[PDB]
Amino acid sequence: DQLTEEQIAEFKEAFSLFDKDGDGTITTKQLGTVMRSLGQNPTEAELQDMINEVDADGNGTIDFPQFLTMMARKMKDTDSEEEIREAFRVFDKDGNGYISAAQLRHVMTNLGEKLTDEEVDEMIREADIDGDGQVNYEQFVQMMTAK
Amino acid sequence: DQLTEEQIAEFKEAFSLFDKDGDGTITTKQLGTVMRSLGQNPTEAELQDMINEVDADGNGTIDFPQFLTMMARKMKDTDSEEEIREAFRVFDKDGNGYISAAQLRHVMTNLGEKLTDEEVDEMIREADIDGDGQVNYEQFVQMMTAK
Amino acid sequence: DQLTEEQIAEFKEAFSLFDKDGDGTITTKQLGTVMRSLGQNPTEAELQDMINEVDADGNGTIDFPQFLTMMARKMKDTDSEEEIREAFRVFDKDGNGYISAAQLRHVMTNLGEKLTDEEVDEMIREADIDGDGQVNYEQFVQMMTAK
Amino acid sequence: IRIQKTIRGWLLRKRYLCMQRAAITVQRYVRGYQARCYAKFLRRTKAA
Incomplete structure (x- = not known):
């Protein structure tokens, strides 16, 4: 659930790299792209599940708490x-x-x-x-x- | 008398086995063939009587309801x-x-x-x-x- | 009649394949499909008989322990x-x-x-x-x- | 006449019963093979 601060900094820096809008929260497609960039293990079906969950949230961006939650989902x-x-x-x-x-x-x-x-x-x-x-x-x- | 529906379904399955048309109607020859194939014992005289009863209609084909009535009469x-x-x-x-x-x-x-x-x-x-x-x-x- | 652990692992793998949840629980139809996938071939009537025997009393679905018991008793x-x-x-x-x-x-x-x-x-x-x-x-x- | 009618009826009954038993066995083997193929297909899809 809660990761090492080193990984926290790495994820925030990947955000900023892909933060074209600069909001600090990564977009759903950008979320999948950085999952592919960070050695994570998301499924295309899992990627669509994440996308529809964020659409239900409606913001279109990934906040750090949910980011850490799906880090936990990945490393499980x-x-x-x-x-x-x-x-x-x-x-x-x-x-x-x-x-x-x-x-x-x-x-x-x-x-x-x-x-x-x-x-x-x-x-x-x-x-x-x-x-x-x-x-x-x-x-x-x-x-x-x-x- | 009323026949048990399990026996009726078995009779329909037996009829469909040799029913090369699949319409629930078949020639009197295969009527007697499946009559014997059911394990019952009709006399060839009774077979000819049943054949002429069917031919009175002129169809030459054994519809499933009349087939069930024939089954009941054989059960008699x-x-x-x-x-x-x-x-x-x-x-x-x-x-x-x-x-x-x-x-x-x-x-x-x-x-x-x-x-x-x-x-x-x-x-x-x-x-x-x-x-x-x-x-x-x-x-x-x-x-x-x-x- | 305990089953070999390699077969147990294969059963769990088949559970993962058939069940999207992958929690080790499958339905009665899925139970029959896995029965026939292992190379054991019971009839559809036989499969229904064993389904009624187990009655999905584990959690409403054939889970791993009931699966092991069924494969043990129905080994042939x-x-x-x-x-x-x-x-x-x-x-x-x-x-x-x-x-x-x-x-x-x-x-x-x-x-x-x-x-x-x-x-x-x-x-x-x-x-x-x-x-x-x-x-x-x-x-x-x-x-x-x-x- | 009774003997011969009963005999022919029993013969056709036995023919039908043998047909049914063979069909049930063949259906059982067919379903087993189909389930085995489906399991292998699931394995391949997961690995892919």
């Missing part, structure tokens, strides 16, 4: 590398960490959250992913938790 | 298992509890309402009847009555 | 690929390994408990489409055994 997940490495393994029929980009991205987009074609293209290009070869995921999650 | 008549036992005892000339398979086959083939010899072979194979070995009438009646 | 391996093949041969009046798709749909929808048309369409599309209009139940049983 306590997700680690190993669970999603295992998820990739069950997706990796090879089992060697090297996974085919084509089928992996098809399952990634078609099943569950649907990705736009652009997002897939830039994510493949910038994440050293080969066009059709077998790409390792372990380093990706290692630098997930490293960030 | 109920022969007993002891009657079948006595009928088989009549053909048990030896009276040793066993009857000859070949003579029973001849009885089936060349008496009254003659039926196909392939049906006789069906009786032989399904009731594990030995071709020449004596077969107990009572065991046949019991496994016939098990239903 | 009655499912056999040869049994499925024999049943399909029973369907196969011709006995050529192919059962008419229209006849199979009619039997599934009309006989006994009524399957949803989507289920029959899924089964038709699952097996290879054939020119004769008959599904080859041999390969069907093959990938039923595979997964």
Whole structure:
């Protein structure tokens, strides 16, 4: 619920960075953007839930108390590398960490959250992913938790 | 009398099984087929009587309400298992509890309402009847009555 | 008959999959879906019987302890690929390994408990489409055994 | 005549009963396979 003052300062500074209006309270879309920026773990469905909760509030901006509350909601997940490495393994029929980009991205987009074609293209290009070869995921999650 | 709705539903399901049209009406041939398939025993004379009653309308198809009335009228008549036992005892000339398979086959083939010899072979194979070995009438009646 | 902890973890994982809340509580229909997802195949009538047996007395929904008790008491391996093949041969009046798709749909929808048309369409599309209009139940049983 | 009518009736009854039993078993296996596929689909969607 209540975080370390270091994280408080980091969140306020991220606010100010994304405080285009300068109000000090982050917008819903800006809330999702900074959640993506701060290594948080929001779901697209969870993001829409937060958006509609703020719309019910009606201000359109995230105050610090609710921000800390949804920090608590995020860190209650306590997700680690190993669970999603295992998820990739069950997706990796090879089992060697090297996974085919084509089928992996098809399952990634078609099943569950649907990705736009652009997002897939830039994510493949910038994440050293080969066009059709077998790409390792372990380093990706290692630098997930490293960030 | 009023028939229990569970039996009515079972009868409707049986009708729909062979109803190649799905309209609740079917040809009198399959009417008799499902009449026998219900486990009841109508005489072919009674079958022809029912067929002519239906043909009086000229439809040639057994609507479900008239089908239910036919079911009730069949429920009116109920022969007993002891009657079948006595009928088989009549053909048990030896009276040793066993009857000859070949003579029973001849009885089936060349008496009254003659039926196909392939049906006789069906009786032989399904009731594990030995071709020449004596077969107990009572065991046949019991496994016939098990239903 | 306590269950293995790996199976317990798999049950909780299935609860997370099926239940959006992910609290370990699922509905009776969800109970049947999870029963049939684990590889145990009881009939719809059987599933209703066990549902009435448990009666959702835990919290109105099949929770984790009642789920463990049900899987413990209803553990079985009655499912056999040869049994499925024999049943399909029973369907196969011709006995050529192919059962008419229209006849199979009619039997599934009309006989006994009524399957949803989507289920029959899924089964038709699952097996290879054939020119004769008959599904080859041999390969069907093959990938039923595979997964 | 009584014997033969009863016999043919019982034969068709047994045919119908065997049909019903086979259909129930096949429906049970179909539903089991469908539920298994749905569970695997849920796993894939969650991981994705």
